[PDB]
Design a protein around this nucleic acid. Structure first.
Length: 53
RNA sequence: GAAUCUCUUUGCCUUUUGGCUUAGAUCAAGUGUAGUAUCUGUUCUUGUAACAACUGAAAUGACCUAGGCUC
């Protein structure tokens, strides 16, 4: 239980950090604000995944 | 009773793994794109006799203190 719980919490944290980041990236893309091609691709992928979820 | 050895079970053991990213990407393409670099064979290359002169070289080793004669 405890170890598992801790792991869960950290993955939640990661998600929070990740999802927010993705959102930010998307916003940037929408604007037209020096997005990296690779970064944009990642955002597209990540965002797609999020949508699916 | 004490010493030791052999086997079995439990505990202990890699009853199996040292990262992240768009599962990293793709199982497709008359490709495009940028750069970096030089080659084929065919040929040139006097004799005879007489007189004057020498009779012989080289190798390493035997003597003496690189040099000097002998074998």
């Amino acid at each position: 239980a405890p170890i598992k719980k801790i792991i869960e919490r950290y993955i939640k944290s990661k998600a929070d950090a990740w999802v927010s980041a993705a959102h930010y990236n998307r916003e940037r893309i929408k604007r037209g604000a020096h997005v990296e091609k690779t970064m944009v691709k990642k955002n597209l992928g990540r965002l797609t995944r999020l949508w699916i979820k």
